[PDB]
Design a binder for this molecule. Structure first.
Ligand code: A1CYM
Ligand code: A1CYM
Ligand code: CL
Ligand code: CL
Ligand code: CL
Ligand code: CL
Ligand code: CL
Ligand code: CL
Ligand code: CL
Ligand code: CL
Ligand code: CL
Ligand code: CL
Lengths: 493, 493
């Protein structure tokens, strides 16, 4: 990796290389011997801890309790269900030995914990007094996917949380499915300044055993690829029937539980980086940056040295007293411009420059990372203006990313309008009959039309919860049948 | 598992079965298809989260930053070092396939992350400005150990934290080694009410590449087996030489870094259960129990029902207003005695009984879990007395466990005195010359003397930091040579 000090690929001209440079030169990640596995350095894992604390706070209000189930799973429990999502079998890593000894029975590594947890649920669930059962895990899962691996986005091994619940009836379960989905929206908006779109995945793309799969969909405008930001399934009684999870209800009749399972991944970090990063490097919402402010001294005269270091330490004291973490870069070995690029690259939201002009005027210079706008601030008002500026940066990052998302969403009706939008790097909202047979024809056929890596087919992303009005005689864009609902389409990571 | 409602094995008469009953009937764990892997239910994982928050708070003060490295490791990096602790090779689980496809290169699952992290350290460490480097992981590791598996104590898969640091010189590193060790002591004392003994492991039992291995040693008096509660290694330059971790110092001379690595495990939970549990089931320090108080109504007259439920809800309001979580068990389906045993079994520190006698006297009955002592408390003073009683329970649990630890420590000098103590289930402090050749002779030979599961040999546990005075002509108990220091010996889990 060359030119460690700066980003030499513009986000638009070469988005792929720009992303690799940002995550490495900002010290978020490091690559690894094993393809698809990545080292989350402290800067990246700080982001994970912030969203982890937030999500834990909110799911505790729903009485979800954390837990930990084994990393390994027997070939019996896992492969016991070929009616659920058994498309993980080609991706399931198998341990076959310890040392030079071979295992008697092979054991797999969890791609997800549905079979591990739900094999014990019948023991914990005997009557309606035992429901609802609400569990969550903060763990690591493994999926061996031949598809091109992308840091944070499609990885062989990723940290996540997987919640699983079971309920007395349908109404209780589905309300939790969407309550979690809104927590995912806050996960992205409040802490990552990333807008998403709530929807319902088509029958073709839904989770294996799910009744339906709700999703939060993000979009990378620069390369026109949607990403499944987070997921919340209503499994209904499907999984309850497979694993014989039954309960005596209030009227002595035995019933199947209604289950959910929801998960969000370090993929949120990748989406955040792609949404806000620019050619100077990493851009962070203040809520996920360890250092909210960096104080850079700027002078040349040896006489000013003593006065300036004290003035900067005054600012460091004001901020840290107000619980605003910050770094005072007083390294004399590096030029002021080196410090500028170094901390812009690391994504520090705010830079406070202090120079001789500042001492006499009793002020400072404050520079927003998102737009590089500078302003003079009297020393007394530094604390308040810094607080309001961290808020304004977050408000600005979200609204800019929302403008880019909406500019990428185009509403069309005909097949030809759809392809023009598709090859212009847009996410297309079109009327669709939702017949499942049309999903594979649409994907396979659009790929043959998009002449000139990642999959080039146009999948159905999600059917938005927010439905624009459907005209009376509107026809599906592909089949010509009467159209049921508007659906989002596009290429995907 | 029979008699789910109570513990049918006395902790002394059958300690092994008593432990299995406690951890399952108190809903801490559930057994699993794969030997050595255990399900940490919410009650057990709440304990993990409390100590996890505490340890994270304190290591952040030392500027240790959390991170996450890959679960997998190549056969090259792992086996590159046969001079370090390569005794993990027989315990290293190997993935050899994904799906029906075989992997080109086999990949292992981390038993520990020394090789994973230290293969990247040279990239992050170029000069003295880059030191100290302080990293930590909250992750899961795997060791396939044929030894008899015990929940929380010796498991195939366990949660832990592994810190790793690198320093400019020896003084900086070793100070951190012992600073972490004291954090482990607070981990056990402050939050688990478990006393431990700081020591230095013998040269025979030290960690693979360590210069020395400091340890915190706990002791299960009932079955007379010591356990390695926590560990903190000074690796010195040993690992720096293996992985070529060098740095340009302040005087332009390249040097090797001085490293440490420290870890503590869910084994702390197992030690806590064994130390405080009694025949009624689980006994918890208040700091690791979700519910500090359980309010049980006790009446028979239908007339009293309305008044009593309001009186109990008043107490629930007082406690929860003071941030003292509690459960008001108003289930009319279960007898009051059922509730008593149910919540004593789950380890709730305090039970507040409310009956008709309480309403007229405007008081309540408070029952300590640790000693079942009951006392009347006027309703007004419930909040204060409850707070002081949670503190007194913790003070009592620690001091009781410390009395049992010290009664199990016996100081002897001759070989025959040592064996009498050994077969009386004691941890023996004896003078020892520390010659390494004597470690395998002592272990192998004491096993042949202890006539009539787990290893029956007497290992050297640790050489305490607190050294009682050594007489002038004191001779090692085994060799007759002049004795260097007092060392602890005993059987181990
Ligand atoms: N390969 C990857 N690389 C990087 N980041 C990610 C994120 C991924 C993902 C995230 C959420 C949900 C799903 S899911 O639809 O498979 N549902 C499940 O697993 C269910 C629900 C949780 C319990 N099991 C997948 S996969 C992946
Ligand atoms: N098999 C088991 N079952 C249940 N609980 C436990 C706990 C165990 C343990 C705890 C602390 C330290 C050690 S260590 O001495 O091996 N040192 C290392 O790994 C170093 C230091 C951290 C980074 N690598 C082992 S092993 C084990
Ligand atoms: Cl590969
Ligand atoms: Cl809101
Ligand atoms: Cl996906
Ligand atoms: Cl410079
Ligand atoms: Cl603004
Ligand atoms: Cl086995
Ligand atoms: Cl103290
Ligand atoms: Cl050990
Ligand atoms: Cl009963
Ligand atoms: Cl007391």
């Amino acid at each position: 990796h060359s030119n460690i000090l700066g980003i030499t690929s513009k986000k638009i001209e070469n988005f792929s290389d720009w992303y690799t440079q940002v995550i490495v030169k900002s010290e978020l990640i490091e690559y690894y011997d094993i393809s698809g596995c990545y080292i989350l350095r402290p800067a990246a894992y700080y982001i994970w801890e912030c969203v982890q604390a937030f999500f834990n706070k909110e799911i505790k209000k729903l009485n979800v309790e954390n837990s930990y189930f084994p990393l390994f799973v027997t070939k019996n429990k896992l492969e016991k269900e070929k009616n659920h999502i058994e498309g993980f079998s080609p991706e399931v890593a198998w341990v076959t030995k310890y040392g030079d000894s071979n295992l008697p029975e092979e054991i797999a590594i969890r791609p997800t914990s549905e079979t591990i947890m739900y094999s014990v649920f019948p023991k914990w669930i005997r009557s309606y007094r035992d429901l609802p059962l609400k569990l969550n895990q903060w763990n690591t899962v493994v999926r061996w996917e031949f598809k091109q691996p992308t840091p944070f986005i499609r990885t062989r091994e990723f940290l996540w949380q997987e919640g699983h619940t079971a309920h007395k009836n349908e109404e209780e379960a589905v309300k939790l499915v969407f309550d979690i989905l809104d927590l995912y929206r806050r996960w992205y908006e409040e802490y990552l300044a990333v807008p998403i779109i709530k929807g319902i995945k088509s029958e073709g793309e839904k989770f294996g055993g799910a009744n339906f799969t709700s999703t939060a969909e993000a979009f990378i405008s620069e390369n026109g690829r949607a990403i499944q930001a987070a997921t919340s399934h209503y499994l209904g009684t499907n999984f309850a029937k497979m694993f014989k999870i039954e309960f005596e209800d209030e009227n002595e009749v035995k019933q199947y539980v209604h289950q959910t399972s929801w998960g969000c991944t370090t993929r949120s970090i990748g989406i955040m980086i792609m949404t806000h990063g620019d050619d100077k490097g990493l851009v962070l919402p203040p809520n996920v940056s360890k250092y909210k402010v960096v104080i850079v001294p700027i002078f040349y005269k040896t006489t000013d040295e003593n006065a300036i270091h004290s003035y900067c330490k005054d600012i460091e004291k004001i901020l840290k007293n107000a619980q605003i973490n910050c770094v005072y870069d007083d390294r004399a070995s590096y030029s002021p411009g080196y410090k500028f690029n170094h901390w812009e690259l690391r994504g520090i939201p705010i830079r406070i420059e202090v120079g001789p002009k500042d001492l006499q005027n009793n002020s400072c210079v404050i520079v927003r990372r998102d737009n590089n706008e500078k302003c003079n601030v009297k020393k007394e008002s530094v604390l308040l203006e810094t607080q309001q500026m961290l808020v304004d940066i977050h408000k600005n990052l979200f609204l800019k990313a929302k403008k880019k998302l909406d500019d990428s969403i185009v509403q069309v009706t005909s097949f030809s309008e759809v392809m023009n939008a598709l090859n212009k790097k847009k996410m297309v909202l079109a009327p669709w009959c939702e017949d499942i047979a049309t999903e594979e024809e649409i994907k396979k056929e659009t790929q043959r039309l998009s002449l000139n890596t990642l999959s080039g087919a146009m999948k159905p992303l999600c059917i938005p919860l927010d439905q624009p009005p459907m005209p009376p005689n509107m026809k599906c864009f592909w089949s010509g049948k009467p159209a049921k609902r508007w659906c989002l389409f596009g290429r995907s990571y």
